[PDB]
Amino acid sequence: RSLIVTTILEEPYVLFKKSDKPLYGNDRFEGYCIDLLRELSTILGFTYEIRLVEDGKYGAQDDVNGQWNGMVRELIDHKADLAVAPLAITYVREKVIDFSKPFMTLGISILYRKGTPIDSADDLAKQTKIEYGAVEDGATMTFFKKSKISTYDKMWAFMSSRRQSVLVKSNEEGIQRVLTSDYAFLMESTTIEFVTQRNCNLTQIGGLIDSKGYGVGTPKGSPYRDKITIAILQLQEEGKLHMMKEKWWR
Amino acid sequence: SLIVTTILEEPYVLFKKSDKPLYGNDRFEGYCIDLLRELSTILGFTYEIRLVEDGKYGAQDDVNGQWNGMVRELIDHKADLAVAPLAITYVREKVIDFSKPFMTLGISILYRKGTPIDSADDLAKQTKIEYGAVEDGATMTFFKKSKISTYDKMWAFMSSRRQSVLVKSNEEGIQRVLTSDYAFLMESTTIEFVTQRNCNLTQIGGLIDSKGYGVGTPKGSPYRDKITIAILQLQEEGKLHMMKEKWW
Numbered sequence: 001r002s003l004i005v006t007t008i009l010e011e012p013y014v015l016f017k018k019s020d021k022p023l024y025g026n027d028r029f030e031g032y033c034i035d036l037l038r039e040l041s042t043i044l045g046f047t048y049e050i051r052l053v054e055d056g057k058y059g060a061q062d063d064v065n066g067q068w069n070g071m072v073r074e075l076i077d078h079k080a081d082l083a084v085a086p087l088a089i090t091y092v093r094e095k096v097i098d099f100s101k102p103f104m105t106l107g108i109s110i111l112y113r114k115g116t117p118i119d120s121a122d123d124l125a126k127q128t129k130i131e132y133g134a135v136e137d138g139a140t141m142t143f144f145k146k147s148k149i150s151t152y153d154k155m156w157a158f159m160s161s162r163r164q165s166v167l168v169k170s171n172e173e174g175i176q177r178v179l180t181s182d183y184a185f186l187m188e189s190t191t192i193e194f195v196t197q198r199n200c201n202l203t204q205i206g207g208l209i210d211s212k213g214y215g216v217g218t219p220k221g222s223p224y225r226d227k228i229t230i231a232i233l234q235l236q237e238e239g240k241l242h243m244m245k246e247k248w249w250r
Numbered sequence: 251s252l253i254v255t256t257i258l259e260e261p262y263v264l265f266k267k268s269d270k271p272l273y274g275n276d277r278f279e280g281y282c283i284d285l286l287r288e289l290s291t292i293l294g295f296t297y298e299i300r301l302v303e304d305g306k307y308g309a310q311d312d313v314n315g316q317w318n319g320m321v322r323e324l325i326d327h328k329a330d331l332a333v334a335p336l337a338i339t340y341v342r343e344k345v346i347d348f349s350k351p352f353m354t355l356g357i358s359i360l361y362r363k364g365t366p367i368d369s370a371d372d373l374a375k376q377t378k379i380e381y382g383a384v385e386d387g388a389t390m391t392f393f394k395k396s397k398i399s400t401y402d403k404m405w406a407f408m409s410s411r412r413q414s415v416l417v418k419s420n421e422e423g424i425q426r427v428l429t430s431d432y433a434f435l436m437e438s439t440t441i442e443f444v445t446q447r448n449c450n451l452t453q454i455g456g457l458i459d460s461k462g463y464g465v466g467t468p469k470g471s472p473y474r475d476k477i478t479i480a481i482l483q484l485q486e487e488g489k490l491h492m493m494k495e496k497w498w
């Protein structure tokens with residue numbers, strides 16, 4: 001049977017392809033992760049059906065009831081066979097689902113405007129005039145929520161107390177906030193690179209705050225995890241992932 | 251106790267300097283030894299460090315399929331873990347298991363400053379400046395297998411001059427860059443260490459590829475996923491970053 005592949009809209013990894021005519025099935029989608037999925041299928045010999053995650057979330061565990069949401073929950077429940085998306089490999093996720101080895105490496109950083117006095121997370125933490133936030137229920141939010149580092153702990157205190165006003169539903173919403181208000185957005189460096197190649201007034205501020213990879217997610221125990229790792233290693237070595245990066249980040 | 255295979259390579263693993271003779275695990279220090287210590291704390295194992303007898307990382311013989319180096323030790327179940335700057339590669343992942351990466355890197359070029367050489371392509375299209383890599387490591391294996399024109403050409407050069415331009419260790423390659431007209435293909439993490447200590451040397455060009463170092467285990471080992479979890483803990487705690495800062 002075809003594998004069910006959960007994913008999420010996120011430029012330039014996954015987007016709706018443009019056409020003057022209606023599009024159907026997998027042909028509706030394009031992006032770096034869609035190219036990745038196609039190449040994985042070429043190597044491993046599977047067929048697949050792409051399905052956008054219904055709640056539009058990456059995945060986090062609820063504080064109170066300990067339930068997961070997003071693509072992570074879809075894998076846990078065996079509603080999908082793979083998640084092919086910019087899904088960060090994290091400690092808490094690795095406890096409940098499996099991941100291939102990373103196809104891309106990245107870290108949290110800051111998206112803000114050029115020409116300002118802000119040069120680091122510490123600069124943001126030490127003030128309140130410039131608001132800042134992150135995507136709700138993603139790995140970046142979770143990093144701040146759990147950090148014992150003073151600077152990041154202070155930042156979580158600020159974001160948490162202003163949740164409704166500074167946390168956003170999507171990277172797109174965050175980027176828009178940066179473009180239209182005095183706001184700095186905590187987000188992943190890979191995605192910042194895409195944004196700053198298109199928006200010449202924006203820049204990454206400071207360096208990477210952490211390091212992590214994106215991996216293909218599978219339900220815990222899936223035999224596809226190790227096969228997908230081997231295929232990713234092949235695509236990396238052949239230079240195909242690099243060409244895909246160049247294609248989509250232009 | 252676990253048997254841990256490793257290899258001498260600054261600043262990942264080195265012999266501690268000391269006045270008094272050292273024994274057993276006390277003999278060793280470095281980034282990978284700190285990593286091993288952190289992993290043993292999280293997972294609750296004790297261990298014996300043993301340097302790989304043949305001094306090799308691991309490659310497969312093109313004729314008879316035999317492996318050497320730390321990879322061989324894992325295949326033969328002579329070691330439980332390999333904790334070293336051991337690159338996760340396609341060919342190795344088919345025969346051993348690896349944790350997720352504790353460090354990310356890529357092949358690049360080590361050479362002297364002040365020249366017009368700016369890329370692998372610049373090296374490939376000439377012969378005056380010789381170039382090479384560590385024998386029986388991941389970098390050599392990348393070139394050997396590459397379908398990319400420039401890299402295929404570089405493999406043709408290197409293999410035809412194997413006895414002169416391929417070296418036994420990074421240390422030997424670095425000395426060769428310092429004493430002759432030679433550019434060394436080597437891993438970017440190690441280049442960073444070298445260029446922070448040798449102001450006449452520099453990385454040429456960017457990364458030629460992308461890979462990680464992982465803890466190796468025999469195929470099917472229960473330790474692989476446990477070590478991955480521990481590495482993720484260490485990354486998220488900020489310890490992997492502090493470990494790199496310490497040794498670099």
Ligand SMILES: N[C@@H](CCC(=O)O)C(=O)O
Pocket residue numbers: 058059086087088134135137138139140141186187188
């Ligand atoms: N890629 C992230 C979502 C975006 C973010 O948290 O910055 C994740 O896997 O949760």
Ligand SMILES: N[C@@H](CCC(=O)O)C(=O)O
Pocket residue numbers: 307308335336337383384386387388389390435436437
């Ligand atoms: N770290 C490499 C050895 C050095 C190199 O090939 O540049 C390996 O795992 O084989």
Ligand SMILES: [Cl-]
Pocket residue numbers: 099100101229348349350478
């Ligand atoms: Cl893995």
